[PDB]
Amino acid sequence: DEDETTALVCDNGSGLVKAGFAGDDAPRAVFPSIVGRPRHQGVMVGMGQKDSYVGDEAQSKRGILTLKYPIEHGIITNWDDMEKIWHHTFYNELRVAPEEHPTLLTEAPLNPKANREKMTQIMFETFNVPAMYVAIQAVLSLYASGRTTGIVLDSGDGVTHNVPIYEGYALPHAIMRLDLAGRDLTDYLMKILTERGYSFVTTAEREIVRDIKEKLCYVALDFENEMATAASSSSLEKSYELPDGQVITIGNERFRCPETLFQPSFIGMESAGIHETTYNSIMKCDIDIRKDLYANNVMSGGTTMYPGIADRMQKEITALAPSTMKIKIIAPPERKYSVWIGGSILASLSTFQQMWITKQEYDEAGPSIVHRKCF
Amino acid sequence: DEDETTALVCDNGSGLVKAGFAGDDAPRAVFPSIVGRPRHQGVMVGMGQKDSYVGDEAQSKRGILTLKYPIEHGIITNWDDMEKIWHHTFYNELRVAPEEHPTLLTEAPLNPKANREKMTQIMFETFNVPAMYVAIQAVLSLYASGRTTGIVLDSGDGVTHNVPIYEGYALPHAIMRLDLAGRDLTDYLMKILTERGYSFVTTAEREIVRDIKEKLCYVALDFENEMATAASSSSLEKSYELPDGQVITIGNERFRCPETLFQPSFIGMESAGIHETTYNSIMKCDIDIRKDLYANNVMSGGTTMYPGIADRMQKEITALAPSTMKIKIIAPPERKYSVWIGGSILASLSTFQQMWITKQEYDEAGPSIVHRKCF
Amino acid sequence: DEDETTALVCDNGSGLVKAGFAGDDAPRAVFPSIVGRPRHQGVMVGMGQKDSYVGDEAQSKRGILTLKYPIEHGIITNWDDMEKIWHHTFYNELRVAPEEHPTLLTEAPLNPKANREKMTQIMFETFNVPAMYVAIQAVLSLYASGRTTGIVLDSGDGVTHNVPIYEGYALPHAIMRLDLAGRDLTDYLMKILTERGYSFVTTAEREIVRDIKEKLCYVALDFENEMATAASSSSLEKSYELPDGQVITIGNERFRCPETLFQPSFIGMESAGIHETTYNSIMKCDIDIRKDLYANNVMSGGTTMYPGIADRMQKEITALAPSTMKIKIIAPPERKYSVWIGGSILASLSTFQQMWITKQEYDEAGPSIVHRKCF
Amino acid sequence: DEDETTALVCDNGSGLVKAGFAGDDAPRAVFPSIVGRPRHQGVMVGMGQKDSYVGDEAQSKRGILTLKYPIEHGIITNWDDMEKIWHHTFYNELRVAPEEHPTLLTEAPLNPKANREKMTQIMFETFNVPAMYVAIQAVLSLYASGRTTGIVLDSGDGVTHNVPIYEGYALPHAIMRLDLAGRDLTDYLMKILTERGYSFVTTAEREIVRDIKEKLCYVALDFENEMATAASSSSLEKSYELPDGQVITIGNERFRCPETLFQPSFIGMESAGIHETTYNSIMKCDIDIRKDLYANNVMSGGTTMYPGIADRMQKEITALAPSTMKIKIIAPPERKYSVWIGGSILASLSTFQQMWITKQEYDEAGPSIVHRKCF
Amino acid sequence: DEDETTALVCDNGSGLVKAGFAGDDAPRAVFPSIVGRPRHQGVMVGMGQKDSYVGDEAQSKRGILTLKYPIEHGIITNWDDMEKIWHHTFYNELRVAPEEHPTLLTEAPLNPKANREKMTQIMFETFNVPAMYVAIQAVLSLYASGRTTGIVLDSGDGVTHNVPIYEGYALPHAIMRLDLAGRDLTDYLMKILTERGYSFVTTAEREIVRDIKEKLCYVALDFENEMATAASSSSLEKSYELPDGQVITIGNERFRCPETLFQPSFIGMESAGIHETTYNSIMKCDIDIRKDLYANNVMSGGTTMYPGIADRMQKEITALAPSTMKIKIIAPPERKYSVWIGGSILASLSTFQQMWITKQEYDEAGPSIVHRKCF
Ligand SMILES: Nc1ncnc2c1ncn2[C@@H]1O[C@H](COP(=O)(O)OP(=O)(O)O)[C@@H](O)[C@H]1O
Ligand SMILES: Nc1ncnc2c1ncn2[C@@H]1O[C@H](COP(=O)(O)OP(=O)(O)O)[C@@H](O)[C@H]1O
Ligand SMILES: Nc1ncnc2c1ncn2[C@@H]1O[C@H](COP(=O)(O)OP(=O)(O)O)[C@@H](O)[C@H]1O
Ligand SMILES: Nc1ncnc2c1ncn2[C@@H]1O[C@H](COP(=O)(O)OP(=O)(O)O)[C@@H](O)[C@H]1O
Ligand SMILES: Nc1ncnc2c1ncn2[C@@H]1O[C@H](COP(=O)(O)OP(=O)(O)O)[C@@H](O)[C@H]1O
Ligand SMILES: [Ca+2]
Ligand SMILES: [Ca+2]
Ligand SMILES: [Ca+2]
Ligand SMILES: [Ca+2]
Ligand SMILES: [Ca+2]
């Protein structure tokens, strides 16, 4: 605060920017990292009072907006708009200057080497920031839950990761990366929706595709066995008159799309489901290591909030794995803010001082300060 | 030939099947031991005229194939496909029956005891083969070059070996084995390629990873000293517009991956570089033995064809070793066929008759005929 | 104790540090002389609460440790770590100061002359120790059992020894030394394990190799005769589903490795089995001496705890030896602590005062005090 | 020669077979009576062109050989190999048939009665030899130097002897025999080498032990006085970087092993040094006999070629002996061939005809012909 | 006894100390006059409970002892140890003080004049002894058998003597002395044993040489005639598997060593056999004296207990001697204690009082008391 650093806590992504102060219970400032642009065109006298629709203000009015997606995988299509997105975070909501407090961000595992410097360059060289540290997505969720060892599969929208963690951080061998996250599932629904009679192609309806999914589509216990169950007119058929002006008879469609996550074969790829890669990464490890990896299967993120997600991991895991320990998927009561809570503690402890990167340190070692101190 | 044995010469592996007749200069039949399977899916009217893509026919069209890898380390994932691979060798290209000529194969050092019998079983018990002998990979390369004593480090894709050889064959004491060969380097590139902005994950691009490496990536003389040299924009930066439709700005990446071979630390293991193990195996031997081991350091295989491979062995070897003899890595003009030439002579000499295994000998002593005669 | 000497009893080695107080029945403090180092690498926030893993704390968690072996034969690879190992013995477990009590250690027969002074130097010159004496490994086991004459073959991990003992101590003539102990057997298993299909190469699995051996591998009565017995599917084949997640079908492997102890030919050496050297050392002695050497064949150490060890010495000994006395291998009910019990008595008797080395005696005769008083 | 006898000259032993023609200056054919056997094992295609390595051909390549020692004291471990050793002497090097020339050999003093007949049996009964005579080792060295009276101490490898000689040959009373020769010193070095940190145990390094000794180890003038001199860092400390790849810091070790020859106490025996037995054998003789025994102390053999051997005999002899004559050890310029020169003359003179044993004489008196004519 | 003299009876030598009380049948205390010293060396904790091994205690354990021979001919190598030998006789076994009883010892014929006084000096001047008398070895054996005239050849270990005895004691003229006794035969066996293949050189095997002789080696009736008999494989060849662990094929060796006694020519001397000197001493005497000398040829001592000793004296004596009387060697049933029995009577009779030397008599005439009273 003015006369002292005092850092904030932020978990930026391509879905929700979880920013807030220190010592809170839930994120105060939240909005999707997306900028809207007028598509209606024409002239203006009484406009919507916005030139570049952003966040909640943008997501609210979709009809007139052409949602520009900055962070599309990890690569940013354009950095020019990112500058205004950050100008909206500090000055507007938080109402605090960036030339005052440090900044705690999240690191999308295996992000281009140029981004690490490019991002920090916008803070330190451009808008003089006292300090900043970009922690590694998943690792934070471990301490928040109160664990110190297990296997964390933190996936959101950008990318997918299988990170087995121990008291000592893992190494490039058991960990994996895959480009089959939420955004891939969102753009896939429209594809399979054509066989029934739906076509949410354009932008204003591209978001609706995401909306119908989260609050209805359930995951099947056994796709192959429930496919024939579709004949039974009782458990599936349920007219859901969308409270707006349309009926969406979702029968065999409810568990046809979610299966794609575990069955990319419906897309046209070689990559096996995320439950096959789970075996691949574990089976390689030494014999005297797996026993505790199954004891605590950590599954965090919004991807793990679909009605009926743990039950599926009761047959798939037990199949190709030892049978000595008890199996159960751990999904904390509040798994969504798993990353936000963990970062709050580190930003509160004074011991963290001997880790972060100080302002002057950047200038004293140029842009290479990053890879010069950390890895 | 029909009325007489007359053996062939084959050096099978997981990269190139070097088969041909006797008295030739170069291998006639060559193809990778890999089978492809359709991944595009759908229906067929005018197909690619293949049910199980194999060898050159397979490697040619990667886009539609899901390259099934039979020989993955030494262990074969599946033997059912191996039967067709051998059905393609004799009948198709060579156009000669296996019930006619013997067979000279190579032995992957320290291969499971069951394989020795299992392989021969497919020849003798299944497709009646007059005779066969499976010689030991490296030893053949020694006579081909015209040497009788030295240290041969024959490595390809399957496994790595350090075989010091003398007039009398070595013994389990100085020789070593390691699972850090080409295939480990091929699957590693994609890992470190993510820090820059590349992700050749799926199969159709898994092979491209191998292609870019061999015809560009050079080996550094001093990694630690050339890492800082990266700042110099002249010796590294060279836009290589891949003749297809993409630019691959390889600067510090050219000598970052090759170093992994000698620096597994970048992976996450304990195993030291293959140049450390070289010391380990030699330093144990008697004092009055090393002087000639350095005089002729044999380095064969495709692994020893990277621009700038001998220069590195001029500082590493001389460091922890006596300084009495002259040091120089011997890489014959044609080191790739080092194994093929050596086997050709043995398959030509009539004196070899008192060594190989005859057809009936297998039936007269059951499957144990192998370990019963040889070791 | 503070106002008086009162010595402890220690039997240090490269396997178990048998330390404890006086007047006990079993060793209180026990741990392997090995230090672990993080190999997982990365960063730390909630570490394993250890910088240099040691003893039980180290052996417990192998996955993250790179077991540094200090005492590797007798020669110590590095003395810098040995200082902390001894700092862990007194202060932590025993909770007694070294500037208070003497110290009773064991002497690895035929240890470098420099070590005798180097070791004592760390006690007397560095951490002022009132007194210390380093007794000779085997001799102690003789009195513990309650014997005064026979032939003791005390072997553990460091080195092998054949020490015939009489009321008057032996002399360099019948005694022998050999570098073919446990550590040689431990590192050998991985070698022969490759013919079947196992490769416990790296460190985290190097220890597992030692674990599977001790609690399963039995010793054959007649290797050459039991090799053919392997055909019989009843006495060997027994699926041992390792309680973890893997099956280890040990058939002819159970008695293939143990035979190497008595048959180094499987390695590639000239040294005959330890049962041949037994003849060599005895056959030289006078004619009127052997009769009592066979009457009591002492065999101590963990090496003599494999199911079926005495039976083998019923044919090998009787073969090339007189046939007048009764033959039987003496392995006391508790042969493991044979050295610990013997040293306890000497450390209890007050008559021992006229033997040990006093603190000041070291300073009054410099470092040469050792060879100046004793030999 | 074919149409006539004409004898050769041979001085066979367990170190060098000094064979050659008559009228030469130095031995033409020389090699150690040792046979080598492959220990590397495995298979063969380009072998070392030898089944039973012998002599120079064997000593050259030690690494692959398991040096079989035929003549081990006097007793021959095995006679079957001795047959080939002699087949190598005549036919190969000399290129002359044994059924043509006699044979002059040496007699190891006090050799089993059976050997005299057994050896001759292989020549006369097996490979019809015209004649042969086996003269007594030392006596020959007397005439070669040109002396007719004195005390000869001819020792090599087999056994030690103190033979006082006069115009009339000595008698079993002053002469002595002892089993403390070179071979005992060679196998002793490895014993005392363990206190420093060396262990040349196996065969390939057993010979190296003999090599380091002869060309470095010097003999002390006063061991007890030079033991304290070790403190002086100038006369002893001299880094001898063995031209191969190892440093052997020999300080107090140079004169510690040689002393064992004169001080068997370091081994564990009762036998006094060879300089004590010298007194024992002389002090018994009559009073009017010693005066000339000291005047000419003959010391021949390779044992008397260590830098500083005569000086030691200047204090030890003068101590317990009369002081009337001048004392000086006589070691001819060429003392190594002392036995070869003496035998050459006897094999040249025609007067020798009335001494040797003729072919038919053996058959006319059976195998007992030896003890029937000579003693 | 305390209040009165009462003498003991002792026959000390270098083989057996025959001591005991008066009125007994056999000697109670018996042991060889030899002291042992540790040769094994090293350190001690549980020693053999002896600093100076003596007598039975010493002879029992030879392996660790360096048998010190005090009385070596007659001359004592060292008197310092003799003091303890006598301290062991009275105090330990007999449990009686020397300041209480006289002492009856034996006199080695022709012993140095200084010894007579030196010995008595240790008794009278040092350990106040009431009285003592040193009788002449052989003369005692005469009365024991019950004879009063003949020729006694009493030989043991020290020296040889030919003592013709009559009612009146002999005189220096017919009597003789020779240094060719048992000890000379014991040290000779090892010499001739080398021609066959034995070498019992060191101390621990020096005694074994004496052991094998007494209980096997027989004496030939006619050496020259039995030498050829060796060819006959029936009367000689008899495998005597020494009950310990070795075979000693004694054929012509059984009667080769014993002959040396009568044929010193095999050694290298001029002295004729003890049967030639027998003639020499008798042929000189008057003509009218020999007739009774042959009638009773007394032969006592352990030397006359070899199977077949009298038969030899049936041809040798009758050869060069008158043929009027009957010839027969007299060897009493118990000839070993011939000296002990004779001395017992003299020590029992009260008439002996007027002969022995009283305590005070020594002080009243100084050390010369011996030659002053007796001769
Ligand atoms: N209750 C829910 N059920 C299923 N998906 C949800 C739920 N709430 C949010 N999501 C989804 O989670 C994703 C955002 O998760 P988040 O962890 O913020 O991603 P990122 O950090 O990669 O931007 C969006 O795809 C959103 O639709
Ligand atoms: N010119 C080259 N430079 C570098 N690597 C090469 C070259 N040519 C071939 N290779 C590589 O060598 C390997 C095949 O070598 P090979 O000896 O046939 O192996 P294997 O016998 O183990 O199947 C492949 O990894 C291939 O990419
Ligand atoms: N029950 C057992 N059976 C076989 N080996 C055993 C047993 N218990 C311990 N060992 C082995 O004994 C060795 C340790 O013995 P120890 O006498 O302490 O050796 P050192 O003193 O040389 O360190 C280790 O190799 C260990 O695996
Ligand atoms: N220059 C030398 N100095 C010391 N020892 C030597 C020398 N040359 C040879 N020897 C030794 O002499 C011995 C051979 O001597 P030799 O008289 O031939 O013996 P033998 O006749 O008993 O076989 C070997 O031990 C050898 O190492
Ligand atoms: N039964 C026996 N046969 C042959 N020699 C024997 C026998 N018993 C003892 N001796 C020998 O007799 C000698 C001892 O005789 P002894 O009369 O006591 O001698 P001394 O009095 O000279 O000491 C020893 O050499 C011993 O080996
Ligand atoms: Ca996420
Ligand atoms: Ca290869
Ligand atoms: Ca031990
Ligand atoms: Ca010699
Ligand atoms: Ca006697």
Amino acid at D331: A
List the end-to-end C-alpha distance of chain A, in Å, as a whole number.
30
Residue B18 β-bridge partners:
B11
According to DSSP, the residues that pair with D235 across neighbouring strands are none
- Confirm if E84 and E54 have CB atoms less than 8 A apart: yes
Tokens coding A91: 């000055």
Radius of gyration, CA atoms only, chain B: 23
Q: Is C149 exposed, middle or buried (0-12, 13-18, 19+ CB in 10 A)?
A: middle
CA angle C195, C197, C199 (to 5 degrees): 95
Burial class (CB in 10 A: 0-12, 13-18, 19+), A126: exposed
Chain D residues whose CB is inside 8 A of the B375 CB are: 42-43
Coil/strand/helix, residue D20: strand
| Token digits of residue B214 | 């061999």
Test C195 with B75 for CB contact under 8 angstroms. no
User: Given a contact as 3+ CB pairs under 8 Å, which chains touch B?
Assistant: A, C, D
Instruction: Give CA–CA dist B149/B167, Å, rounded.
Output: 6
Q: How far is CA B184 from CA A372, B215, B260, E127, in A?
A: 29, 18, 10, 95
How far is Cα E128 from Cα D369, in angstroms, rounded to an integer? 69
Q: Does B172 touch chain C (CB under 8 A)?
A: yes
User: Which of B217, B210, B208 minimizes the C-alpha distance to B243?
Assistant: B208
3-state helix, strand, coil in chain C (%, to 5): 35, 15, 55
CATH fold for domain E136-181+271-332: Nucleotidyltransferase; domain 5 (3.30.420)
Question: What tokens does C271 get?
Answer: 């040294």
Q: Which residues surround ligand 7, an ion (CB under 5 A)?
A: B 156
Question: In angstroms, what separates the C-alpha of E258 from chain C's closest C-alpha?
Answer: 24
A97: its two tokens: 């200057």
Q: Rounded distance, CA D109 to CA D127, Å? A: 26
Q: What is the rounded CA–CA span in Å between residue C198 and residue E38?
A: 56
Cα separation, D89 vs D80, in Å, equals 16
A154 CA: distance to closest CA in chain B (Å): 18
Backbone dihedral region for residue A170 (phi beyond 0: left; psi -120 to 50: alpha; all else: beta): beta
CA distance linking residue A221 with residue A234, whole number of Å: 17
Q: How many contacts (CB atoms, under 8 Å) link A and C?
A: 60
Residues 6 or more apart in contact with residue C175 via CB below 8 angstroms = C109, C161, C162, C163, C164, C281
Nearest CA to CA, how far is B171 from chain C (Å)? 6
Q: Tell me the β-bridge partners of E36.
A: E53
Q: H or E element: which one contains C18? A: strand C18-20
Token code pair at residue B255: 């000598």
Enumerate the β-bridge partners of residue A298: A152, A330
CA of C138 to the centre of ligand 8 (A): 8
Q: State the Cα–Cα distance between residues B181 and B159, nearest whole angstrom.
A: 5
DSSP string, B295-354: HTEE--SGGG-SSS-SGGGGTHHHHTS-SSS---EE--TT-TTHHHHHHHHHTT-GGGGG
Distances (CA, A) of E304 to C11, E71, E153: 61, 22, 10
Distance from CA of D41 to the nearest CA of E (A): 36
- Residue A141 makes CB contacts below 8 A (sequence gap 6+) with A152, A154, A298, A300, A338, A339, A342
* DSSP codes joined into one string, C72-118: ----BS-STTHHHHHHHIIIIII---TTTS--EEEE-SS--HHHHHH
3-state secondary structure of D330: strand
CB C70, CB C33: distance < 8 Å:
yes
> What are the pocket residues of ligand 1 if the criterion is a CB atom closer than 6 Å to any ligand atom?
A 13-16, 156-158, 182, 210, 214, 301-302, 305-306
Nearest chain C alpha carbon to E243: C324
* CB contact (8 A) between residue B267 and residue A113: no
Dihedral sign from CA coordinates of D107, D113, D116, D119: negative
- Could you tell me the two tokens for E358? 């009283």
Question: Would you call B179 an interface residue with chain C, using a CB distance cutoff of 8 Å?
Answer: yes
Tell me how far apart the alpha carbons of residues C209 and E181 are, in angstroms, rounded to a whole number.
Answer: 70
Written as one string, the DSSP assignment of D208-267 is: HHHHHHHTTPPPPS-HHHHHHHTTSTTTS----EETTTEE---STTTTTSHHHHH-GGGT
Q: How many Å apart are CA E182 and CA E301, to the nearest integer?
A: 10
Nearest residue (by CA) to ligand 4, atom 17, is: D156
d(CA A328, CA B103): 54
| Among the listed residues B270, B165, D248, E224, the one whose alpha carbon sits nearest the alpha carbon of residue C200 | B270
Please answer yes or no on whether C64 and A168 come within 8 Å at the CB atom. Answer: yes
Interface of C with A in 221-250 (CB under 8 A): 242-246
Q: What share of chain E is helix, strand, coil (3-state, %, to 5)?
A: 35, 15, 55
For the CA atoms of B243, B248, B254, B258, the dihedral, rounded to the nearest 10 degrees, stands at -80
Measure CB to CB from residue A113 to each of B195, B267, B268 and give the nearest one. B195
Separation between Cα atoms, residue D153 and residue D121, nearest integer Å: 31
E197 part of contact set with chain C, CB < 8 Å: no
Nearest to B149 by CA among B162, B167, B170, B135: B167
Task: Collect residues with CB below 5 Å from ion ligand 6.
Answer: A 156
**CB spacing of E40 vs C171 below 8 angstroms:** yes
Testing ligand 4's pocket by substitution, the residue of D152, D209, D305, D339 carrying the most ligand atoms inside 8 A of its CB is D305
Please, are residues D163 and D274 in contact by the beta-carbon 8 Å criterion? Answer: no
Q: Which two tokens stand for residue D92?
A: 């190969």
C-beta of E27 in contact with ligand 5 (< 6 A): no
Neighbour-count burial of A353, counting CB atoms closer than 10 A to its CB (0-12 exposed, 13-18 middle, 19+ buried): exposed
Closest residue in chain A to residue B68, using alpha carbons only: A270
Nearest residue in chain A measured CA to CA from C241: A322
Residue C307 identity = P
Nearest-ligand number for the alpha carbon of A10: 1
Q: Cβ of A53: how many Cβ atoms within 10 Å?
A: 23
The CATH code of domain D35-68 reads 2.30.36.70
H-only helix segments in B193-244 = 203-214, 223-229
Q: Residue C132: beta bridge partners?
A: C357
Q: Which amino acid is at A323?
A: S
Pocket of ligand 3 (CB under 6 A): C 13-16, 156-158, 182, 210, 214, 301-302, 305-306
Resolution (A): 8.9
Q: Which ligand is nearest to the CA of A163?
A: 6
Experimental method: cryo-EM
Count the helix, strand and coil residues of chain B and give each as a percent rounded to the nearest 5.
35, 15, 55
Token pair recorded at residue E346: 């003299």
Q: Between B and C, how many CB-CB pairs are < 8 A? A: 32
Q: Which amino acid is at D189?
A: L
Residue D198, both tokens: 């060396």
Residues paired with residue C151 on neighbouring β-strands, in sequence order = C164, C297
Ligand 1 centroid–CA A335 distance in Å is 11
Which amino acid is residue A269, in one-letter code?
M
Q: Answer whether A20's CB lies under 8 Å from A9's CB.
A: yes
| CA contacts within 13 A on the Cβ side of D92 | 14
**What secondary structure does DSSP assign to B72-133, as a single string?**
----BS-STTHHHHHHHIIIIII---TTTS--EEEE-SS--HHHHHHHHHIIIIIS--SEEE
Give the sign of the dihedral formed by CA C28, CA C32, CA C33, CA C36. Answer: negative
Type of residue found at C180:
L
| CATH classification number, B182-267, choose in 3.20.20.10, 3.40.50.10900, 3.30.470.10, 3.90.640.10 | 3.90.640.10
**C38 has which bridge partners?**
C65
- DSSP class of residue E188? H
Residues in chain D: 375
Chain B, window 105-164: residues with a beta carbon less than 8 angstroms from a chain C beta carbon: 110, 112-114
Q: For the stretch D251-275, what's the b/e string if a residue is b when 16 or more beta carbons lie within 10 angstroms of its beta carbon?
A: ebbbbbbbbbbbbbbbbbbbbebbb
Neighbours of chain A (3+ CB pairs under 8 A): B, C
Residue A261: name the closest of A139, A141, A108, A155 by CA.
A155
Residue at E268: amino acid letter: G
**Strands D160-165 and D150-152, how do they pair?**
antiparallel
Q: What are phi and psi of D81, to 5 degrees?
A: -85, -25
* Distance to chain B for D57, nearest Cα, Å: 14
- Return the CATH number of the domain spanning residue range C4-34+71-134+337-371: 3.30.420.40
CB neighbours (10 Å) of residue B13? 18
Q: Which of C301, C296, C344, C342 is nearest to C142 (CA)?
A: C342
3-state secondary structure chain A: CCCCCCCCEEECCCCCCEEECCCCCCCCECCCCCEECECCCCCCCCCCCCCCEECHHHHHCCCCECCECCECCCCECCCCCHHHHHHHHHHHHHCCCCCCCCCEEEECCCCCHHHHHHHHHHHHHHCCCCEEEEEECCHHHHHHHCCCCEEECCCCCCCEEEEEECCCCCCCCCCEEECCCHHHHHHHHHHHCCCCCCCCCCHHHHHHHHHHHHCCCCCCCCHHHHHHHCCCCCCCCCCCEECCCEECCCCCCCCCCHHHHHCHHHCCCCCCCCCHHHHHHHHCCCHHHCHHHHHCEECCCHHHCCCCCCHHHHCHHHHCCCCCCCCCEECCCCCCCHHHHHHHHHCCCHHHHHCCEEHHHHHHCCCCHHHHHCC
Strand partners, B357: B132
Residue A99 φ/ψ, nearest 5 degrees: -85, 55
User: Which amino acid type is present at position D160?
Assistant: T
Integer angstrom CA distances of residue E236 from C185, C258, E249, E353 = 54, 50, 9, 56
What ranges do the domains of chain C cover? 4-34+71-134+337-371, 35-68, 136-181+271-332, 182-267
Q: Do D195 and C110 touch (CB under 8 A)?
A: yes
Q: Of D35, D43, D90, D42, which is closest to residue D59 (Cα–Cα)?
A: D35
Q: Which secondary structure element, helix H or strand E, spans residue E151, and what is its range? A: strand E150-152
Q: Give me ligand 5 centre to Cα D282, in Å.
A: 30
What are the two backbone dihedrals, phi and then psi, of residue A329, each rounded to the nearest 5 degrees?
-80, 125
B196 at interface of A, judged by CB pairs closer than 8 A:
yes
* Secondary structure (3-state) at B51: coil
Beta strand A104-107 with A131-136: parallel, antiparallel or unpaired? parallel
Residue C120's φ and ψ, nearest 5 degrees, are -60, -30
- Domains D35-68 and D182-267 agree in fold: no
Ligand 4 atom nearest the C-alpha of D14 is: 23
Cα separation, B163 vs D62, in Å, equals: 20
How far apart CA B258 and CA B235 sit, in angstroms, is 17
Chains B and E touch (3+ CB pairs under 8 A): no
Residue the block writes with tokens 């690879």: C77
Q: Which residues pair with C131 in a beta bridge?
A: C358
Distances (CA, A) of C23 to C5, C97, C105: 15, 19, 17
Q: How far is the C-alpha of C284 from the C-alpha of B365, rounded, in Å?
A: 46
Give yes or no for B270 touching C (CB within 8 A).
yes
> What does the block give as tokens for C88?
């862990």
- Determine contact: C194 vs chain D, CB below 8 A: no
Task: Give C-chain residues touching A324 at CB under 8 angstroms.
Answer: 243-245
Q: Which residues pair with D107 in a beta bridge?
A: D136
Q: Nearest-CA residue of chain B relative to D65?
A: B168
